[PDB]
């Protein structure tokens, strides 16, 4: 249940940082972690797995768009 | 109330393009045209492991077993050719002018407010400090990011270039115009002056920068880097590859519009470290550091929204790192 | 087992379906395969390729195809360094082995 | 508390260049600026079974069967002309100086405490028996890797050129120099004290290092080995690819530079094996073997977090090894 994810918060929706990784019980439970741990304002988020495997995205003023 | 605008976007004046490196022989500098170019090849390496293990890998068999297996990697190198010690990096800047004026913004008080803000700061004192310390990161060799760290000698040739042809020339020695302190001289207030009657849009300016580098017999110029797609294997990795126009290693031209924005000196630590870049939340990522923290209030969005909303206006080095800022260009605003 | 399994009908298939294996030639084909044109260069070419077949008996295709399948595995130094990646090549080996030999008969 | 930098990154000091090989004959070494270059071309190969047998192919048939089909490869072999008994080695040295100051770190205590420590090694001893070191494995032709172990007489000959030309020129023997012995001289003593003024950061050092070796008429040099792309059928194979630069072949800058820092004569185990070059975890990879393991204390790592972190200055000689590590660059640094 304690799963891992990897949140990067990034410019557009295909820009690579590295991300700080989380430990969550659902994925809709690290869509509300990262979208607390939002820095700054015009950024898209994403989750990832530990392997790079897409999740979910969301823009900013939008809502989350689910890919995996 | 005059709130902040929800959008702003100001185009980036001081256009740079991507600047070309060529190589030939010192002492026949004035002949550098047909310079042939420094062309970006391949050459693979082998590395042992370097790095620092995470005290599982520390057992001695294990580092063995990983130094028996090495890896191979092909990555992309630039040099010199071996009949010549002369990098030629050529590049043009046009400096356009209308610093103040957004290419995007809702409020029209806002922009009303903002417009008359920097035209206030343009009567005052006009684009002089500015212009002053962009005409010194023309004149030392800024630009020249790790090419300038070993050369011998180093010279700078400016053309300010009319209808078809040069109508005014420079030429600076960039090691003796130090790369931390800006000092006065008689052609870089020429210098400074033409760049000022271009940031302030009474005139058309554009400048052809040449520098030459003394680096050595092939020796490794060093062009910017692009990224890596990484979907092969570990052999064949491809780890580093540079960029290059048309069989021609280059410089990217935000690398070096980063290096002719480096003129703040006025955040609130230790000026013994010299100019940065001028950023909001002016930060160094070599150094890892943030400069003008908004904790402190010297970043570059409580001096706008100080300046402009609320008419504090801050002294006049800070006001010279925010128009610094409009001049740099960016998306502003909230959401 | 079930990989092997496929990739031996993927050849049988690929082999036996149409004549696209000697369709055009060019420089890159990896054509010491030999494996998807079994018939393909024994039909027409009475004497050029088919002594090149028989007596070569090309089964080296099996060593690419471990290379390929070593990639399946995670790169892992934990899974290196611990005794499955000796119980993995083992059983590999063994299916390989059967890959082998049943790419062997094929003049029959 | 003062932990260690997230990143670390040191510029690679002593920068060699792409060793160019060319040949000609003896006792007109001082006319060797026309010489032709030794060309790399292309010869097939036709190959034995030679390896073990893993118990399974012992059969003799099998083997028989085995030895009935050879392989073919179409290998790249570089030799010198038949009328050339001596082959010429051509590389500079660009020494640059600054080795304590990172290029990236994010600590600033920890890049002040560095910076320290790197100012009071220089300061109670400067670069004398590090530069002693680099100057003899500059003497005594290293750098020419195979190409030396079967030769009859290798000279080297070193030009520290200036603004145009060469300012002080030395001349060795490279046999009579060791290949494990660290003696003194008189010439060399001031080519490393030459070698000193430029890792202090007091002068530009540009060495122009050309080495000549007694070989023989048309036997075979030895340039650095590319890898190949592995894409073809076995027949046409191409099982070695050697670089060249252009039309001209070469040995790799990296090997150059790997063979000038091999100096390392303070690690714990028997010297009689010889000086290895300066690594963390100091591991020469045709021994296989990694010593100063982390088990013991004598790798990079921990000499320098005691010797930053906790003030633990070691022996002379281990401080000689990170200061040489230092030179050498690096990315150090955890996640």
């Known amino acids: 249940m304690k799963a891992a994810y990897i949140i990067k918060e990034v410019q557009n929706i295909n820009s690579e940082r590295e991300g700080t990784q989380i430990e969550a019980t659902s994925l809709s439970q690290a869509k509300r972690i990262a979208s607390k741990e939002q820095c700054f304002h015009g950024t898209v988020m994403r989750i990832e797995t530990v392997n790079g495997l897409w999740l979910a995205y969301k823009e900013d003023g939008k809502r989350w768009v689910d890919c995996q | 109330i005059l709130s902040t605008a929800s959008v702003l976007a100001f185009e980036r004046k001081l256009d740079p393009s991507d600047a070309l490196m060529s190589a030939g022989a010192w002492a026949q500098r004035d002949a550098s045209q047909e310079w042939p170019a420094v062309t970006v090849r391949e050459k693979s390496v082998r590395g042992t492991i370097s790095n620092r293990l995470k005290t599982k890998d520390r057992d001695p068999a294990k580092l063995d077993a990983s130094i028996q297996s090495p890896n191979l990697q092909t990555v992309d190198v630039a040099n010199l050719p071996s009949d010549a010690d002369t990098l030629k990096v050529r590049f043009t800047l046009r400096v356009l002018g209308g610093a103040g004026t957004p290419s995007a913004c809702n409020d029209a008080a806002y922009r009303d407010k903002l417009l008359q803000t920097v035209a206030t700061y343009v009567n005052d004192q006009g684009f002089a400090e500015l212009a002053r310390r962009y005409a010194h990161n023309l004149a030392n060799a800024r630009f020249l990011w790790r090419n300038r760290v070993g050369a011998e000698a180093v010279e700078v040739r400016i053309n300010h270039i009319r209808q078809g042809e040069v109508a005014r020339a420079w030429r600076f020695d960039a090691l003796a115009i130090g790369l931390r302190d800006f000092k006065a001289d008689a052609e870089l207030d020429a210098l400074a002056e033409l760049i000022a009657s271009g940031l302030s849009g009474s005139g058309h300016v554009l400048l052809e920068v040449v520098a030459f580098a003394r680096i050595g017999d092939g020796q490794e110029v060093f062009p910017s880097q692009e990224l890596i797609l990484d979907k092969g294997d570990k052999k064949g990795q491809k780890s580093k590859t540079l960029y290059s126009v048309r069989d021609a290693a280059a410089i990217h031209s935000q690398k070096i519009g980063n290096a002719l924005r480096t003129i703040d000196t006025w955040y609130p630590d230790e000026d013994g470290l010299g100019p940065i870049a001028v950023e909001p939340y002016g930060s160094v990522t070599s150094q890892g550091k943030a400069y003008r923290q908004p904790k402190q209030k010297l970043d570059f969005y409580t001096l706008l929204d100080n300046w402009v909303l609320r008419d504090e206006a801050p002294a006049v080095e800070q006001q010279h790192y925010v128009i610094a800022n409009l001049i740099r260009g960016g998306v502003f605003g909230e959401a | ?108």
């Open chain 3, 1 to 108: 087992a079930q990989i092997c399994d496929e990739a031996l009908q993927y050849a049988a298939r690929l082999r036996e379906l149409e004549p696209g294996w000697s369709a055009t030639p060019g420089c890159q084909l990896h054509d010491a395969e030999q494996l998807w044109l079994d018939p393909l260069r024994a039909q027409t070419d009475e004497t050029f390729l088919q002594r090149r077949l028989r007596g070569d008996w090309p089964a080296e295709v099996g060593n690419r195809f471990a290379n390929w399948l070593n990639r399946a595995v995670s790169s892992d130094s934990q899974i290196l360094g611990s005794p499955e990646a000796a119980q993995w090549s083992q059983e590999l080996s063994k299916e390989l082995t059967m890959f082998k030999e049943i790419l062997e008969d094929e003049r029959d």
